[model samples]
Target: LPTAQEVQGLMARYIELVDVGDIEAIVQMYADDATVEDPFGQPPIHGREQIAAFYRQGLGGGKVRACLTGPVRASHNGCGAMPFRVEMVWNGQPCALDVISVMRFDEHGRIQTMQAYWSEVNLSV
Candidate 1:
């Protein structure tokens, strides 16, 4: 199992990658068989190729910034959560969304599953 600090660092790095809008580097953090349920209850997109497409669209437009609204919380079992807000311009106006993301890591520290909790209720435009 990865250490608590290791998981925390990964969370920080993950947010940094999002802010950098490096979709490929972000996708590299996941396992080949990883699954992501962004917004939690939504149907998940499986594998790296789908993950790439997801991020490519999510971070593709405008100047997007992803910043942690709070510290990354870690579990000793290679699972963690981070609360963050994404800032960007949408439809000619500024938009922001607050999200809490939980990631489960494989033995190698690769992300195996990722779930993001958010909705239109969490968005401000």
Candidate 2:
């Protein structure tokens, strides 16, 4: 289990990677068979390969920036939550979304499951 500060550092690193659209760096934070359910109710993305592909598609041909909107909350059991916002600018148009993600990490601090909560109401274009 990781401490709160360590989890915070992990989140900081994740945001930094996302800000730069570093798909490989972002994917490195996950376990080999990790799962991601972004924006809730959607089919989960399974495995590091699929996750990497998803991000690659998202980060392609756009200037994307993501940051934590609030402090990360980490439990002693390798669980964490972070509220964040992401902005994507393409062709001079920009869109943004407010998101909250709950993550369960493996003992090695790699994300095992990441479920994000967001909806159409959270989007701003």
Candidate 3:
């Protein structure tokens, strides 16, 4: 399991990678067959290839800047949660989305599952 400081540092780095739109760097943090459920509902994105495409859609052509709103909450196990703010330009308009994301890591420290908590109500333009 990851330590408290380790979890906080990793999530902060996650936000930093998103801020820079480093898609590959972000993907490298996951396991080979990791899963992601952004917004916590619709459907899960499986595997690294799909995960890459998922991020590509958001960071490929538009401006994206994400920041951590507070410290990450680390658990006794290999799970952590983070609150963050996302600012991006979508369809030529700027919007802000507040999100709380939970991530579980494998013993090797690669992200195994990631779930982001957000919704339409969390967005503002």
> Whose lDDT is greatest here?
1
Candidate 1 per-residue lDDT, tens place, 27-118, comes to 99999999999989999999899999999998887389999999999998999999999998877798999999999999998999999999
Clashes of each: 0, 0, 0
- Give TM per candidate: 0.97, 0.92, 0.95
Clashes of 2: 0
- Candidate 1 vs candidate 2: the TM-score winner is 1
- The segments of candidate 1 whose C-alpha lies over 4 angstroms from its true place after superposition are none
Clashing residue pairs for model 2? none
- What are the clashing pairs of model 1? none
User: lDDT tens digits, residues 54-121, model 3?
Assistant: 99998987478999898899987888999999998768888999999999988878889999999999
Alpha-carbon RMSD, candidate 3: 1.0
TM-score of 3: 0.95
Judged by whole-model lDDT over C-alpha atoms, candidate 3 comes out at 0.90
- lDDT (C-alpha) at residue 95 in model 3: 95
Candidate 3: the clashing residue pairs are: none
**Candidate 2 displacement at residue 71 in angstroms:** 0.8
